[PDB]
Ligand binder design. Structure first.
Ligand SMILES: NS(=O)(=O)c1ccc(C(=O)CSc2ncccn2)cc1Cl
Ligand SMILES: [Zn+2]
Length: 257
């Protein structure tokens, strides 16, 4: 039942998932001025050379591109992290308009969209167990602005017609998520949560400073997807973002000045 509308959107989630109001919820606004530079933060290590995409799914909240995470193929490590985290899926949040859509904000600035590359700590053996741990997940957040097309995104945009409605899936092999990365890997990092229910507080958030550019036509195709299932009245999949949540104790660290 949760969703992104007037009656079941983020303001209502706390009734089914009381952790919605917890001590380390995401996303947050990143105040770039108060984020602390940390010279001891390591470069982020993204090894996506051996990534095996399997499938793309409309889950009725977003679309997921899923990866084979049964061996250490596509891994995140270094940066603020202490272990190896395997890529399990990526998905996006986006707006009804180019002026909004990102979950994290940068000095209150909203980006047209936000990419989440979700990874789980190898120590916990699988994603299901990892989410029950305070360091179980590492999510790499990348902002999208609208200008130039991202050539590496087109393969994803062209299959969306095949997964229009809730519960549809399509095979989606040999997609290289390295084509979604910006140039710089400078990042902010803070401890947080899933941004959708179950809102589990198991995430180390690694948000890239440098946004990627996507074309107006690429993001327009995101907006043609549907929250509803195939038998049902059309509700465009738009505005599937959770607003910034209270920072509370937390400190956001920066890998850069
Ligand atoms: N917006 S986000 O924080 O990157 C994010 C959104 C959805 C999910 C899920 O996997 C939800 S499905 C699920 N979640 C917990 C336990 C069993 N299944 C995971 C993440 Cl990290
Ligand atoms: Zn997400």
């Amino acid at each position: 039942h949760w969703g992104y509308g007037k009656h079941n959107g983020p303001e209502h989630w706390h009734k089914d998932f009381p952790i919605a109001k917890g001590e380390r919820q995401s996303p947050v606004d990143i105040d770039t001025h108060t984020a602390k530079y940390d010279p001891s933060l390591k470069p982020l290590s993204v090894s996506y050379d051996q990534a095996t995409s399997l499938r793309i799914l409309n889950n009725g909240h977003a679309f997921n591109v899923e990866f084979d995470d049964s061996q250490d193929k596509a891994v995140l490590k270094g940066g603020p992290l202490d272990g190896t985290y395997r890529l399990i899926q990526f998905h996006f949040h986006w707006g009804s308009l180019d002026g909004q859509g990102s979950e994290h904000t940068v000095d209150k600035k909203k980006y047209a969209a936000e990419l989440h590359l979700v990874h789980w700590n190898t120590k916990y053996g699988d994603f299901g167990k990892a989410v029950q741990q305070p360091d179980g997940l590492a999510v790499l957040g990348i902002f999208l602005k609208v200008g130039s097309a991202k050539p590496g995104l087109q393969k994803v945009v062209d299959v969306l017609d095949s997964i229009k409605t809730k519960g549809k899936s399509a095979d989606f092999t040999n997609f290289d998520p390295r084509g979604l990365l910006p140039e710089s890997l400078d990042y902010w990092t803070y401890p947080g949560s899933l941004t959708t229910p179950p809102l589990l507080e198991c995430v180390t958030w690694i948000v890239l400073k440098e946004p990627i550019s996507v074309s107006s036509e690429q993001v327009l195709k995101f907006r043609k997807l549907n929250f509803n299932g195939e038998g049902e009245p059309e509700e465009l999949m738009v505005d599937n973002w959770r607003p910034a949540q209270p920072l509370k104790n937390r400190q956001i660290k920066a890998s850069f000045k």
